[PDB]
Design an enzyme around this catalytic site. Structure first.
Site, mmCIF file in Angstrom:
data_model
loop_
_atom_site.group_PDB
_atom_site.id
_atom_site.type_symbol
_atom_site.label_atom_id
_atom_site.label_comp_id
_atom_site.label_asym_id
_atom_site.label_seq_id
_atom_site.Cartn_x
_atom_site.Cartn_y
_atom_site.Cartn_z
ATOM 1 N N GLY A 39 -2.988 -31.908 11.798
ATOM 2 C CA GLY A 39 -2.125 -33.007 11.300
ATOM 3 C C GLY A 39 -0.756 -33.084 11.973
ATOM 4 O O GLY A 39 0.040 -32.132 11.832
ATOM 5 N N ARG A 120 3.761 -47.561 29.509
ATOM 6 C CA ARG A 120 3.240 -48.660 30.362
ATOM 7 C C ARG A 120 3.922 -49.982 29.958
ATOM 8 O O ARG A 120 4.359 -50.696 30.871
ATOM 9 C CB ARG A 120 1.706 -48.662 30.295
ATOM 10 C CG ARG A 120 1.081 -49.140 28.985
ATOM 11 C CD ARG A 120 -0.121 -48.311 28.533
ATOM 12 N NE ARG A 120 -0.875 -47.801 29.678
ATOM 13 C CZ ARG A 120 -1.542 -46.649 29.725
ATOM 14 N NH1 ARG A 120 -1.590 -45.844 28.674
ATOM 15 N NH2 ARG A 120 -2.159 -46.302 30.841
ATOM 16 N N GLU A 322 -7.342 -6.793 -14.445
ATOM 17 C CA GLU A 322 -7.013 -5.340 -14.424
ATOM 18 C C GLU A 322 -5.513 -5.127 -14.666
ATOM 19 O O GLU A 322 -5.119 -4.159 -15.384
ATOM 20 C CB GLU A 322 -7.353 -4.694 -13.076
ATOM 21 C CG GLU A 322 -7.225 -3.170 -13.107
ATOM 22 C CD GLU A 322 -7.265 -2.473 -11.762
ATOM 23 O OE1 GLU A 322 -6.725 -3.056 -10.805
ATOM 24 O OE2 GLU A 322 -7.862 -1.376 -11.663
ATOM 25 N N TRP A 344 -14.049 -0.670 -12.733
ATOM 26 C CA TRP A 344 -14.080 0.633 -13.456
ATOM 27 C C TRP A 344 -15.473 1.004 -13.989
ATOM 28 O O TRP A 344 -15.563 2.053 -14.661
ATOM 29 C CB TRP A 344 -13.067 0.599 -14.602
ATOM 30 C CG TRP A 344 -11.642 0.653 -14.153
ATOM 31 C CD1 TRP A 344 -10.810 -0.404 -13.920
ATOM 32 C CD2 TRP A 344 -10.871 1.842 -13.907
ATOM 33 N NE1 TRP A 344 -9.584 0.046 -13.518
ATOM 34 C CE2 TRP A 344 -9.584 1.416 -13.510
ATOM 35 C CE3 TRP A 344 -11.142 3.215 -13.980
ATOM 36 C CZ2 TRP A 344 -8.562 2.319 -13.212
ATOM 37 C CZ3 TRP A 344 -10.140 4.105 -13.665
ATOM 38 C CH2 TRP A 344 -8.865 3.659 -13.295
ATOM 39 N N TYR A 370 -3.922 4.486 -16.521
ATOM 40 C CA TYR A 370 -2.735 3.653 -16.232
ATOM 41 C C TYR A 370 -2.170 3.110 -17.554
ATOM 42 O O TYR A 370 -1.023 3.388 -17.923
ATOM 43 C CB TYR A 370 -3.113 2.573 -15.203
ATOM 44 C CG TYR A 370 -3.498 3.063 -13.821
ATOM 45 C CD1 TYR A 370 -2.568 3.537 -12.903
ATOM 46 C CD2 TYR A 370 -4.822 3.001 -13.402
ATOM 47 C CE1 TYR A 370 -2.949 3.942 -11.623
ATOM 48 C CE2 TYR A 370 -5.226 3.413 -12.137
ATOM 49 C CZ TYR A 370 -4.291 3.895 -11.242
ATOM 50 O OH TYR A 370 -4.760 4.297 -10.019
ATOM 51 N N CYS A 430 -4.926 6.717 -8.455
ATOM 52 C CA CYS A 430 -4.653 6.612 -7.003
ATOM 53 C C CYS A 430 -3.193 6.193 -6.832
ATOM 54 O O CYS A 430 -2.552 6.712 -5.888
ATOM 55 C CB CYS A 430 -5.628 5.674 -6.304
ATOM 56 S SG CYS A 430 -7.202 6.508 -5.982
ATOM 57 N N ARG A 450 -1.515 8.075 -3.454
ATOM 58 C CA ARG A 450 -1.926 9.412 -2.980
ATOM 59 C C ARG A 450 -3.157 9.279 -2.085
ATOM 60 O O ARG A 450 -3.390 10.142 -1.227
ATOM 61 C CB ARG A 450 -2.222 10.336 -4.164
ATOM 62 C CG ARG A 450 -3.444 9.932 -4.970
ATOM 63 C CD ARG A 450 -3.738 10.978 -6.019
ATOM 64 N NE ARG A 450 -4.812 10.468 -6.843
ATOM 65 C CZ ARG A 450 -6.089 10.502 -6.509
ATOM 66 N NH1 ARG A 450 -6.453 11.076 -5.364
ATOM 67 N NH2 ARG A 450 -6.988 9.975 -7.334
ATOM 68 N N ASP A 453 -8.123 4.141 0.617
ATOM 69 C CA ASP A 453 -9.338 3.624 1.307
ATOM 70 C C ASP A 453 -8.942 2.312 1.980
ATOM 71 O O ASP A 453 -8.711 1.328 1.271
ATOM 72 C CB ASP A 453 -10.498 3.419 0.336
ATOM 73 C CG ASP A 453 -11.588 2.495 0.835
ATOM 74 O OD1 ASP A 453 -11.604 2.178 2.042
ATOM 75 O OD2 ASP A 453 -12.411 2.111 -0.003
#
Ligand SMILES: NC(=O)C1=CN([C@@H]2O[C@H](COP(=O)(O)OP(=O)(O)OC[C@H]3O[C@@H](n4cnc5c(N)ncnc54)[C@H](OP(=O)(O)O)[C@@H]3O)[C@@H](O)[C@H]2O)C=CC1
Ligand SMILES: NC(=O)C1=CN([C@@H]2O[C@H](COP(=O)(O)OP(=O)(O)OC[C@H]3O[C@@H](n4cnc5c(N)ncnc54)[C@H](OP(=O)(O)O)[C@@H]3O)[C@@H](O)[C@H]2O)C=CC1
Ligand SMILES: COc1cc(Cc2cnc(N)nc2N)cc(OC)c1OC
Ligand SMILES: COc1cc(Cc2cnc(N)nc2N)cc(OC)c1OC
Ligand SMILES: O=c1ccn([C@H]2C[C@H](O)[C@@H](COP(=O)(O)O)O2)c(=O)[nH]1
Ligand SMILES: O=c1ccn([C@H]2C[C@H](O)[C@@H](COP(=O)(O)O)O2)c(=O)[nH]1
Lengths: 548, 548
Positions: A39, A120, A322, A344, A370, A430, A450, A453
């Site tokens: 665009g 032109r 979560e 979980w 947690y 984690c 800590r 992944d």
């Protein structure tokens, strides 16, 4: 080799492109590519009226010269037209009459540049302002042959781009990706994956209620004793990267062919490159097999973008549910399974709880994780069904009240590592802690992790702790600043390498933005409906495990 | 207009110097300068005999050439010397006769180098070897104006280094600082602070039971359309650093003059700079006042050196005594005060405890701090004197077991930040957690610090957690690898700025080493005398508050 007219006369193109308002035929299952941003115009103006920051770029790119560099160019030029030969040195800009007439009056003619109009119908005659005209494309190579210009820039519109691109007269395209969707009648041409290749992606920025970035497409092929001191100081560096043969970098042609990788997504991508190339081969917890390295830091500017990876498709409904579940204080796996959030599930099975020695824990009772530590740290945990009202320390209230009452405290920490309750948890956290920092009405957040992944987990982790920052910031009437992600044991499963290699060779898109419902002012009062990702442009979903 | 013989013929000096066993009569507290490193020879050999890595440096520098850069060097030498002309290209090395005879026979003549020997006693006939005998320094410049060579290296010994500086024929000195003391009979000449300056400091290394680094003295005074994309990309920055005018770069003359700042001390020094120039001005209420930034990572290689800052004097007795105290699980300030260690004195006061609303807390009872948490996390704290036997989690013993038995665990953390106990502590812990990482029988440690006093606290913090890392490594039969320091709230106090500015302009010395008594096989059985810092070379002590 040899030289085309594009190389000789240093003729580049500069553009800025939208997404287009098509009637999507019940398909939010949308595919995105480089042509997604085309665009150019609507009713003879830009589709976004004004983008202040692009306007800054476009000026600085067209109004820049280095006099120093001019000498070399004047040689290679004059030697080729076979004719070997104060104001200031200036760049040329080339525009179609239609484009000229669509530029406001105050900008015409574009300061400290050599304004050229391809027309032109009209001629020098008709233009009451200080210009040059031309009526064909060969006529420009001529005007260039004569004049005192550092670089020549094609500033649109579509017709002028399409033809200059057809006869491969442009050396690079400086391309602004405006990452919002507007009404458009005119469009930039389908750039040819063969003929032109992205070599550079800028930072992402916010300007006029939209994110945007700046990429560079490149035309296809086919002190010195202080530099020696560098070599001497690198004298002990290992000869080649440890897993060179093992990963084979020649496969990442594109990732490696990029000059400037300033898009923040490269913070994640480069850690993945670093681990694959220099990561330690380790094998246990299952014998599953990882490449691992220790201690990385990533910083995202939440004021300019929402860092949801664009080199693959990501989904956040689950991540958000979560987050809301931690905030309520919950340890009840069933609540999340009823919303089909199965993050979980694996850690709530009888088998998993039994290996974890929790023989006296109900299935999906994840123990004091947690949520329980956020709202009741210190409280003796009983079961997921107990209301723990007023029992243990409500850190979440505490850190929200510290931000409001004592922004300059250095004790605004939220910690899930309750060492007393580690063994009682389905899985020790984690995500060890968030620490906050307030400057000048602005909230930054450090999350220490800590165990990381990198192909499956951290992409989600970034999003979680970025969303959580916004939620905190809004609830405390503050602007979000940075999310700073500290990686501890940082690892790539060997199972992920084929997929991360595919991923590393995909050029990130400009990131999206997060819209929180502004009416929500207590951390406990958010609903899944209160969250909206806007303008998420992404590559295809990648199965990280490529198994079948 | 003069052109220097040393610039035209590229004449360089390379040397290695230890500290001298000089009679330090009542000098147990002794002043240190760049002449501390001046020891060249003993009894016709190197005072230290072999240093493998010095040898690897020397070979790399004295052999390394680059052909591209010859075309210019030949042109320049020819121009100066009246001429114009135009197999495998080499450097010249120039030694004195004693040096030549000091070198083992298996190294002579020096491989892939043109070997020049200065001597009167010996003529060409007294050598079998492929070398040029010259009998005066003028005969060198003759020979250099004849030969094809890249660069010319004076390689000693003392008499040769001497006359080449007498005549200012040296463009740079490549100087290896061997950080060990040896009997010496031959000495490097005192370098003239006015004629020469250090522009570069390498990384610090361990080889043959000594630390060492590489420094470079310099003689004093009297596609590039792809370098254009760099400028385009940086189009949106500020005209200054926030408090640039506030501090003035021209005060860090020495610090900013250095080209390569590869000494690990610069990780600390460079954070001080970043905070001073880009720091946010904040007040810890009542107008105490700091420059703060958020989230930095330093990394030190404990296998290569012990990182005790060398840019000011630090004693480590207190710090080691504090750590032994932690390990015993003690919370009792008097145990330290009776060891003449005042770290916790201010924080143990009636006034101080009453201000923390700890009205029922004995004087110097610091409550459930590091010691209590490392050995009893979760136990309800009674007092200083209660032996809290088999109560709470002993996470110290747990992490020492994880390391020896489950070394690939991503759950080896030691947490001080017990949310239950914070308000009962004299002070919430600054040092939140340590995480460990084992690979190939080597141990690395991350520790996360929430609040970081850069001028006064951090230098001691780096030492504490570096020593702790060694202690744990030994007791688990591992090598120490990395100590990784994650800074959260990084702040310089306004009181500290004048002093830090002084510190920033001091050039680090090679770090010292740490030796543990190797017999200690349990973390509990260490004593003050099991710890020895070898070869601490440091600038004058600085008081950070220059207040009186
Ligand atoms: N975001 C961006 O990057 C840019 C935005 N725009 C958008 O572009 C729109 C206008 O573009 P578009 O309609 O494609 O028109 P153009 O700006 O490309 O101009 C087209 C006209 O230029 C002249 N022309 C084109 N090719 C030649 C040639 N080879 N020789 C001689 N004259 C030639 C002709 O005018 P004539 O008939 O008079 O000879 C032709 O009709 C505007 O709405 C504006 O919003 C414009 C530039 C860039
Ligand atoms: N650590 C390091 O970097 C280095 C270590 N060393 C150590 O230094 C010691 C040697 O030092 P030092 O005793 O000073 O010896 P030198 O290597 O400086 O040798 C001096 C001798 O070289 C000859 N010579 C020097 N200058 C001239 C000149 N201008 N014209 C003619 N002949 C000249 C003479 O030899 P003659 O008597 O034949 O006339 C003179 O006696 C050894 O112990 C060696 O191990 C040496 C080099 C560097
Ligand atoms: C300087 O003002 C304008 C510039 C342009 C061209 C243009 C604008 N942005 C970029 N990135 N490339 C371009 N070629 C197009 C315009 O509108 C049609 C302008 O006026 C609003
Ligand atoms: C390569 O062998 C030697 C080299 C030197 C000279 C030398 C050695 N190291 C450094 N850094 N500079 C030098 N000039 C000195 C020697 O011993 C006297 C050697 O023999 C071991
Ligand atoms: O949000 C999360 C949750 C889990 N993990 C991964 C990291 C490790 O691969 C594993 C944790 O297992 P341990 O570190 O406790 O062994 O889960 C993440 O990366 N992110
Ligand atoms: O080992 C230590 C102990 C204390 N501090 C400093 C950091 C802060 O300047 C101050 C603690 O202030 P709060 O974080 O408690 O606000 O103590 C250190 O840097 N290192």
């Amino acid at each position: 080799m040899m030289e085309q007219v594009c190389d000789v006369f240093d003729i580049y193109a500069i553009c800025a492109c939208c997404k287009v308002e098509s009637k999507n035929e019940g398909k939010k299952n949308e595919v995105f590519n480089n042509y997604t941003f085309r665009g150019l115009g609507n009713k003879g103006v830009l589709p976004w009226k004004c983008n202040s920051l692009d306007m800054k770029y476009f000026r600085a790119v067209t109004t820049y010269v280095n006099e120093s560099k001019y000498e070399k160019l004047k040689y290679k030029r004059c030697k080729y037209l076979n004719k070997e030969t104060s104001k200031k040195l200036q760049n040329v800009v080339v525009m179609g009459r239609t484009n000229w007439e669509s530029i406001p009056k105050k900008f015409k003619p574009l300061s400290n540049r050599i304004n050229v109009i391809l027309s032109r119908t009209l001629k020098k005659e008709d233009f009451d302002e200080d210009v040059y005209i031309i009526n064909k494309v060969e006529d420009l190579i001529v005007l260039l042959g004569k004049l005192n210009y550092y670089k020549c820039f094609i500033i649109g519109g579509s017709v002028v781009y399409q033809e200059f691109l057809e006869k491969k007269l442009i050396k690079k395209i400086y391309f602004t990706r405006i990452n919002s969707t507007y009404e458009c009648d005119v469009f930039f041409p389908e750039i040819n994956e063969n003929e032109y290749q992205i070599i550079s992606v800028s930072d992402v920025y916010t300007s006029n209620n939209t994110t945007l970035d700046f990429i560079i497409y490149k035309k296809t092929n086919n002190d010195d004793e202080e530099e020696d001191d560098f070599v001497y100081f690198n004298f002990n560096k290992e000869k080649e990267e440890k897993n060179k043969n093992s990963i084979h970098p020649n496969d990442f042609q594109i990732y490696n062919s990029l000059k400037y990788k300033y898009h923040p997504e490269y913070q994640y991508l480069n850690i993945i490159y670093d681990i694959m190339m220099n990561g330690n081969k380790q094998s246990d917890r299952t014998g599953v097999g990882v490449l691992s390295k220790f201690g990385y830091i990533m910083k995202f500017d939440l004021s300019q973008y929402f860092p949801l990876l664009t080199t693959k498709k990501l989904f956040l409904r689950g991540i958000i549910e979560e987050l809301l579940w931690f905030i309520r204080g919950e340890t009840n796996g069933n609540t999340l399974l009823n919303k089909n959030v199965r993050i979980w599930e694996a850690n709530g099975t009888r088998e998993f709880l039994d290996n974890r020695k929790l023989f006296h824990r109900e299935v999906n009772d994840l123990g004091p994780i947690y949520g329980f530590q956020w709202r009741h740290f210190g409280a003796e945990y009983t079961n997921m069904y107990d209301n723990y009202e007023n029992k243990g320390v409500d850190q979440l209230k505490n850190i929200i009240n510290l931000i409001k009452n004592d922004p300059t405290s250095r004790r605004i920490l939220l910690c899930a590592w309750n060492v007393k309750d580690l063994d009682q948890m389905a899985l020790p956290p984690c995500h060890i802690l968030c620490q906050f920092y307030v400057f000048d009405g602005k909230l930054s957040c450090i999350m220490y992790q800590r165990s990381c992944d990198l192909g499956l987990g951290v992409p989600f982790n970034i999003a979680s702790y970025s969303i959580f920052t916004h939620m905190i910031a809004q609830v405390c009437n503050l602007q979000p600043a940075q999310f700073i992600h500290v990686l501890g044991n940082a690892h790539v499963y060997n199972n992920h390498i084929d997929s991360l290699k595919i991923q590393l060779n995909r050029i990130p898109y400009p990131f999206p933005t997060l819209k929180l419902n502004p009416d929500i002012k207590n951390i406990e009062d958010f609903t899944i409906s209160d969250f909206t990702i806007q303008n998420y442009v992404h590559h295809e979903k990648i199965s990280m495990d490529m198994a079948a």
